[PDB]
Structure formats: structure tokens, C-alpha cells
């Protein structure tokens, strides 16, 4: 009828591409030609990265850090010697890892009060109900309620370089600057108002497992409470049972000398965090980075195994379809 338009009559102008077999052979080659030079470019990068991870959870009779797997008098102490055979060039990043630690657990991931850690005047006093077990003690509301904040990692890892003399020179670790800029300046804010942080937390208590309240975490007014880097970094669950969390960073020296000269080092740790109750390991990880991140050979050997299986499948499918 007078409704014989291009749409109602099913004759809209279309593209109709005929994806034949004769115009797809130049695909398997243009792919395999830009994936091998990538898989090879991001596979030598992942190899020039220097990295060393020393495990110190004890569990060994001949382990220096075994004398306090279950110590009688705290705090413990333990020194571990590692050896850097090839000096670290750029700025290095000190980490710490934990295995068998399920930070990605339904009953654990959900155990925070995201409105309380955001400076909400009303949440600070009456925390949520998802952080239930660690939500009140002594009839007072725990300041950082929840399990994610109650189990903060609190080992003290220090590094020393055994110089030409027997005396060791301690390398300076930079604490601030290890948490996402957004979730420290925006997402993690202190309570609403006050002069000194010791007041803003009036009717609140310190978590059960902590030693010092959240307003005494650090002596830096911009690193003191709810914005503590070590705290902001722990409160970001790990997504897997074996994770790494940035601990410190060692800025590169203004001169050309290396950031970690090759030699014998001391890793003296204050063993506070018990990770053996649940068969969990505990290690330290120094490393340098690159535009790609850390040392991971998956992207390197995955762009070549996919950019070189095409260059072949593009040939076979060009010799079999070449008979005709």
C-alpha cells in the first residue's frame, strides 16, 4: 500500500559482505606478521627485567627465620642473606607475597565498610553489618571494621648492603606512593573534621588484632589514618590465593650508579605476621619494571604461538587452496 517504504518492504540498503576464502588468506599473514615482531619485542623486555624473591616463612630447621615460627617472646627478629649477581639498573620495587591466603573469599571480600573508610561522619560510629564479626568489641565500634582491615600485613622488612667493610649500609626505602592515586586521594578519606587525627576517632576502637589505633599508623599527617599507603594497599583484595602487594620502592639515584649494586645483602625482618597456621608461604620480592610491567613470559610466548600458528595456517590454507 502507500506504506511501501524501504523499511517496511524489507529493502533497506545494506552492505552484504561476501567473506569468501580468497580474501581471508591475506589476513592470516597480516596477523602473523604483526604478532611475531610483538611477541618478540615483549619477550626480550620480559627477560631484561631483573627480579629476586627470597622466601622467609621459616618452616625449615636450617632457616635463619625459623627460630620464631612460634616464638615465646615477641617481637621476633631474623636476618636473611641474599646475593645480587647483576646490579639493578632502574628504580626497583620491593614487594611481599603470600600463598594459601584467600583474600578473594566471599565472606572476606565483602567484610569492609566502604562508606566508613570514605570519611562518612555517620558510618564511622555505626559501621556496616557485612563486617559483622569484626564490627564491635568492648561495646565500641571498631574504627576500621571488617576482616580485610583486621588482618593487615605487619612485617617490617629492611634491607642492608654489606659494603667493602663489614658494616652494612642501609638502602633507603620510599614508603609513600604505592597506592592507586585515585583510591588514596579520593576513595580513602579521613573522618570529616578536626585538627589532629586522634580526635576524629572518638567513639571508635582499634581493630582486635592491631597494636596501635588507625590514628597512630604513621607520623605523617598525610599518611596517618585511612590514607596510610600500607593500609590502602592491603585493603585491595588480591583476586588469587597467591598474590603480591607493593611494600616499598627504591628510587633511582641521581648519578649513574646502579640502584642495587651487585653484592651481599641483609634482609632482616621483624617476624610479626603468622602465615603457617594455614600452610601459607611468605616471601619478599625485589624487581625492576618496564613499560609492560614486571617479569611475565606469557605475553611473549603467547604472541609468538599465535602469530606463528597463523603464518603457518595461512600458508597451508594457501597451498591447499592453491591446487585450483
Amino acid at each position: 500500500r502507500p506504506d511501501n517504504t524501504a523499511f517496511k518492504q524489507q529493502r533497506l540498503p545494506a552492505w552484504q559482505p561476501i567473506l569468501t576464502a580468497g580474501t581471508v588468506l591475506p589476513i592470516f599473514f597480516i596477523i602473523g606478521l604483526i604478532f611475531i615482531p610483538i611477541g618478540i619485542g615483549i619477550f626480550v623486555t620480559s627477560n631484561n627485567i631483573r627480579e629476586i624473591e627470597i622466601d622467609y616463612t621459616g618452616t625449615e630447621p636450617s632457616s635463619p627465620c625459623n627460630k620464631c615460627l612460634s616464638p615465646d617472646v615477641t617481637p621476633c627478629f631474623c636476618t636473611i642473606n641474599f646475593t645480587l649477581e647483576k646490579s639493578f639498573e632502574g628504580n626497583v620495587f620491593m614487594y611481599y607475597g603470600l600463598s594459601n591466603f584467600y583474600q578473594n573469599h566471599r565472606r572476606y571480600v565483602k567484610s569492609r565498610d566502604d562508606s566508613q573508610l570514605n570519611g562518612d561522619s555517620s558510618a564511622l560510629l555505626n559501621p556496616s553489618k557485612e563486617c559483622e564479626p569484626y564490627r564491635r568489641n568492648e561495646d565500641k565500634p571498631i574504627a576500621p571494621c571488617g576482616a580485610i582491615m583486621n588482618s593487615m600485613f605487619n612485617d617490617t622488612l629492611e634491607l642492608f648492603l654489606i659494603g667493602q667493610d663489614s658494616y652494612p649500609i642501609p638502602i633507603a626505602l620510599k614508603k609513600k606512593g604505592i597506592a592507586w592515586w585515585t583510591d588514596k586521594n579520593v576513595k580513602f578519606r579521613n573522618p570529616p573534621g578536626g585538627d589532629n587525627l586522634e580526635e576524629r576517632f572518638k567513639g571508635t576502637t582499634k581493630p582486635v588484632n592491631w597494636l596501635k589505633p588507625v590514628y597512630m599508623l604513621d607520623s605523617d599527617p598525610d599518611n596517618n589514618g585511612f590514607i596510610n599507603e600500607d593500609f590502602i594497599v592491603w585493603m585491595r583484595t588480591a583476586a588469587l590465593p597467591t598474590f603480591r602487594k607493593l611494600y616499598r620502592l627504591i628510587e633511582r639515584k641521581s648519578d649513574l650508579h646502579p640502584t642495587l649494586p651487585a653484592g651481599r645483602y641483609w634482609l632482616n625482618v621483624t617476624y610479626n605476621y603468622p602465615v603457617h597456621y594455614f600452610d601459607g608461604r611468605k616471601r619478599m620480592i625485589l624487581s625492576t619494571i618496564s613499560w609492560m610491567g614486571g617479569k611475565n613470559p606469557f605475553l611473549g610466548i603467547a604472541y609468538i604461538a599465535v602469530g606463528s600458528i597463523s603464518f603457518l595456517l595461512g600458508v597451508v590454507l594457501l597451498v591447499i587452496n592453491h591446487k585450483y
Binding site: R1, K8, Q9, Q10, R11, L12, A14, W15, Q16, P17, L19, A21, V24, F28, I42, G97, Y102, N104, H105, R106, R107, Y108, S111, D114, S115, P133, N150, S151, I178, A179, T182, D183, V186, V233, T237, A238, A239, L240, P241, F243, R244, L246, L249, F278, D279, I285, S287, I289, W291, M292, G293, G294, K295, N296, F298, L299, A302, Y303, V306, L317
Partner: protein
Amino acid sequence: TRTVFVGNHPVQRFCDNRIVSSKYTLWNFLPKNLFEQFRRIANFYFLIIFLVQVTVDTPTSPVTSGLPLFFVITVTAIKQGYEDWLRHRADNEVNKSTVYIIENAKRVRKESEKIKVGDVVEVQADETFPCDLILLSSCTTDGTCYVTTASLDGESNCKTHYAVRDTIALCTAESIDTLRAAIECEQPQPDLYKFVGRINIYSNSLEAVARSLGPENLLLKGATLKNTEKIYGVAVYTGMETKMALNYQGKSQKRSAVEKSINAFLIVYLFILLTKAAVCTTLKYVWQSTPYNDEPWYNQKTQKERETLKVLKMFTDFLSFMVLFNFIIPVSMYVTVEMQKFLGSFFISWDKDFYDEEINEGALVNTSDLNEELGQVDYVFTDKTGTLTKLQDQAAETIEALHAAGLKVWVLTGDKMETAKSTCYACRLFQTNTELLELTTKTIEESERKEDRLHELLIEYRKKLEHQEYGLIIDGSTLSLILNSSQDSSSNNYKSIFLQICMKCTAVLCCRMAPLQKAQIVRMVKNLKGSPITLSIGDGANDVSMILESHVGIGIKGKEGRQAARNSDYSVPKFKHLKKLLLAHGHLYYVRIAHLVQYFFYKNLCFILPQFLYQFFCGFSQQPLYDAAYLTMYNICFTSLPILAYSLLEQHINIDTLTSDPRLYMKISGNAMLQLGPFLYWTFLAAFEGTVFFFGTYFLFQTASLEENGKVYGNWTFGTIVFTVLVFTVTLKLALDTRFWTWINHFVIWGSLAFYVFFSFFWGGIIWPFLKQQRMYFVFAQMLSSVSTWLAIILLIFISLFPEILLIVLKNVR
């Protein structure tokens, strides 16, 4: 034996004159519609998952299952109740008609639905009768009128009925008032040719004149009155009791062959979901069997959760995985299968190749629930007088397209045997050199002589012969010996032998076929060795029983009457319009909904597989991999339009090259796209991809840093790298299956990838005050701030579309 009074006055137990071509009344709509809604295994599963969530206390709320369910059930009930309200209006323009009546010495004009048994109706030339009248007098003398029941029994000639000699001289509507008679009739029967009654007109003093009635006096309903000024009937049967309405068999529930596959796919995904939820609970309690694998001192249980009985947490843990993986069984595919069924049935109404100038109207759509099974028919049981007939415009070049496409055309008529055989000879259904196997009453004048020839022409004459060599011919008398008398003799069942000659002959022709014998032929063929999709295209009131009995029954908007254009599913105003309705409209309608159900299970098995593999790296604690705003928005926002705009305006073979070429119809015949071969490719390509999304991100997260500043990611950046690879892979798997790239397929395929990337950059980036979580603040703007997360997303989108691409290079050559 009912007693009817002539003037409805003395010298009430009768039905009311009304037409009901609809399914639901106003009272039995819900009790009757809901039952039709729960024939879907997804509406039943989600009513049980909602009933358990309302009697037990579970960590999930009854709104996760009740909200979707109570939306799919009220969307397919506004369409099924609206499409059936239009069938209440078609019967309103016929019931609320005008028919005059001699009420009391005055020509009252009631409606065609307010006629009561025993009132003297009057009809004018070319006016069909409203009810089963009983001719009392005709304008002219001789008390005879000419009626043509071309729509009641296929006979096109003019029949001649007689008046009642006692009242031939009654007219003017003033003498009809002086008529005292009592009509004793027989209770309404469907015979259509027998009748027994009596008239006992009572004179003033004494008169026992009893002129017995017969089938020569009864004027049936639906038979036009030709070549006569007017008549004066006395209604006896009044609708739903008329002999025309006693040959209707009774509406049933018609469901296409794709609505039966959505239930075979929903039964293998009900075992893929009870094996996920059961493999995760069998393992969640061998894992927890260690004392430090539950309550590991860094997350401890509440006093409440510690006392719960262990035999009740094994159940609420199972029921908590089903609710975690319940996206595998989509109930958002029913809100799209009906939005596409309703908006796609418009291309049949809007078509201008269905417009008839000399009747001034085009195709109809009585039900949209069968759009997809027009392109799946195997037998077409046509009618002769009126639909195929002198042949019509192209009623012979259309039977050549129904035979090139692989269909089998049976001509079920109600006219003579050879006279019909001619107009099927004429239509080129029985070519000159086609050995006719005549099982008529002209060769079978006995009860046993049929057997002597039934197998004499199958066991030795038909199989030992091809296509055009042989063709059958039957009757209504003989076909009653093969059906009725053959329900006892089972040593060599007649119906078995006979039903072998029919599937071996090119075309069959059945003559003298009563209105309820064309429904037994459509029923015999619906059962034999499979489920041959049968079509039935008639135009009269005897083709309404074979139109309610077929899988998809077409009706012809002819001149005689619209009794078949009301009880049908579609209606074209010609027979030749069936070549474009099956070849071009059923081939597209099917390929569009057969790909919307293949892609709706693929879509959601790639979604929940990377979330079932996580439970092995979580504590089997049913922790969602993705955010909560990403789980709900996936099926409704991020992936809902690209497939809708495909199932509505996508032609994989141009609509001008499948109307001409009729052999592409057998490419899709037999449910080609929803078979077990194409099903195992969409299910294995969704378990191969869902495994590459997760284990391609699980291997990328072994770096200790994914960016140049040495910062680590959480579990919400792990879940949006598996969700970003997932949305680009299921959206570019449809952009590869698309052959018709309209400007609406360019706007929903690239406008749904530019919305997930804009919604994410917007949902995360503000500290939403109304939320209690604020857990996705910058998980997306930082995920995209690393070069190793770009090179990893564009490598998992290619490793996942390698199968779909390699198949395009192999399947697309020879």
C-alpha cells in the same frame, strides 16, 4: 428431538447465535494462558527457584528470580492477550451485523447474534444465511430458492431447495404473523446432508397437516442465496449448533518447531547447571574438610553461621551455586523471542506482494507465534474449489515451486472425484504420463476387494516401479474403510499399507472429503515416522478443521466467506501468494530466530564459564567474578540490542533471490540450524572461549605488576579484564555472522561496544552516594592505563575468534 415454534409464540433451552473464533474468554485467560506459558522449561525452573527462595532463608533474595520471571510472563501475556483481542473484534464485525426479522407484524432489524430459535428470518439475494433456516416461503411462487454451498462442501453448483407447501403463499410480513406451527427437528448433527423434522401448522378449528421436513428444506448457514428476491426462514439451529459449526474440531495449542528446540536446549543446560552446582559442592566440602581451609583466622565466621546444621548448609550451598550460575538458562531470551515475533509479523502485513486489487486488502496475521515455522513445512494440504480454482492466476506455477522446494502438495477437496481430478490435472498436479492409483468407490465396490488391491499396488506395484510416474486418488467413502474399519484388523493394518503409498507418490488427491475427513488426513501425516510440518491453505468453512489441525494453517480471503480467514494463523488473498510466504518469508523468519536461540546460549555460557572456573581459585565460596552492575547489565544492556536488530532486519540470502530460486528452501528444512551438529559447535565454542577468557587472564596476573609504576591489581580488575574480553568477543562473533549490514546493524553493533566503554568509564569514576560498596571506582580507568592489558585483551579477542574465523576459510570453499 427439539421442538421449535414458528413465531417463537405458543400455538428456551437453545444456544445463542454467536461466533467464537478466539481462544480465551475474559475469565479463563489467566488459568489458560499461564498453563501455556509453563510449557517452557525456563518458566518452570525459575518458578521453583523462586519458591524455594521464599520458604528457606538463603543468602540471596527472592527478587533475583521473581523479578525476571514476573516480567517474561506478563510480556508474553500482553501479546497473547492482545493478539487474541483482535480475534474478538473480527467476530464483533460479524456478530454485530444486520439481519431483518418479522418480529410482530413489523420488519424488525436485529443483529446477527440476537437471533433466537423460532423467529422468521428473511434473506435477500446474495445474502448468506445467518443460521440454519427452514424455508417457509419464497417471494416467487413454486416455493423454491437456489442456494450455492461452495464454502460448506466445496460444491460450486447451485442447489435448489423447496419451500413448505403449507406456507408458500405467506409474505408481506403481515401474513407470517398468522402462522401457528410446531417444528420438531433432530438434535444438531454434523452430517451436513441428513435431516428429519415435522411441521404441524395449527388452523383455527382443526388441522393436523404434518408435512415432514427433509434436507431439501433446510437452508444451512454459510451458503449464499443466489438468484432469488428474498425468502422467509424459521431459524432452527442458532450457532455453535449449526451443521456448519459442528464440523469445527476445536482450537488447540500450536507451538513451532523452534519452541520445541528451546526446550531440548533447556534440558542439556539444566544438566550443565546441576553438574556445575554439584561439582562445586562436592568439592567445596572436601576443601573445607581441612580445619584451616575454613575459618583460617583471617576471616572467621559469625556465631550464627557457626551453629547452622551442616546437613542444611550442604543444601543452601548447592542452592547458592544454582543462583550463581543461573544465567546459563536465559529467561531474557523470552522477552526477545516475543519482541521479535511481534515486530516481525508486521513484514507480512506490510508486504505489497500480498495486495489484491479486486478485493483491496493484503495478507493477515492472526498469530505471530508461528512466523518461524513457515520455512519448515513438509506437506501442504490445499483445497480445490475456491483456492486452486478454471485454475486461478498461478495455481499451477506455484505448485511447481512447492515441488521444487521439496514439499508434497495434497489436494483435499469436497467436490466430485474426476471433476476434481481434472482441476488437479489442470493445475498440473497429475501430469499426462502419471500412473493414477485410483482407490475411489469406482474400483473398490466391496469391503474386501480393497485389500486385494491396496497391497496389489504398494507391495508389488509402487516400490517395484518414480516421482511423476504415479499419483494417488482417494474418496471419502473408501478412506473410511481404511481408517474406521482398519482400527481392528492389525495382522496387516490397512492404514499401514495405505500410508506407504502416500509417502511414495508425487501428489495425492482426495475427493468427496467431508470436513472432518480432511482433518484425519492432516493427522495421519502428522504422526508418521517423525514430525512432518504440515500446512493447510483453504478458503471455506470445510477447511477450518484441517486448518486448526495443521502445524501452520493458512486461510484464503476469498469471496464466498471469511470462515477460514478467522480460524487460521495467516491469510493471503490468493493461493499464488503462498510461494512468497513460505519461500521468502518463512526462510527468513526461521533463520532469524534459529540464530537468536543459538546465540543466546552461546552468549551466556561464555559468561558463566569464567565464573565457574573461578570457584577453584576462590575458596569455592560462590564469590562472583564480575561486579554486580555488570552481571545484570550484560543480558539487557550490553548484549541485548545487537541480536535483536539481527533477528528483525537480517537477510542471509537476499529476499529477491530466494523467491526466484525455490531450492534454497530445502537447505534449512528439517530444523537445520537447531540440530545436534550446530548445537555442539556453539556449546564447544562457548566452553573454549570461556576458558580462554579466564585462563588467559589468570596467566597474565603472575607479573606482580601490569604497569610501569609497579602497582598491583585486585579481584575487580581481574573480573573486568575477563568481562571486557567477553563483551568484545560475543559482539564481534555476531558482526561476523552478519551478511546484511543495514544502518541499524552498524548502530547497535558499534553502539553497544561504545556504550560498555562509556558506561564503565562513567559508572566507575564517581563516588556514588547511594551505593554501599563503591568498589568499582577506578577499576576500568586503571585497567586501561597499562599497555600490557591492551596487548592482552586484543590477543584474547583473537584467540577466541580463531575458530569462528578458521571455519570461514574452510566452510566457505567448496
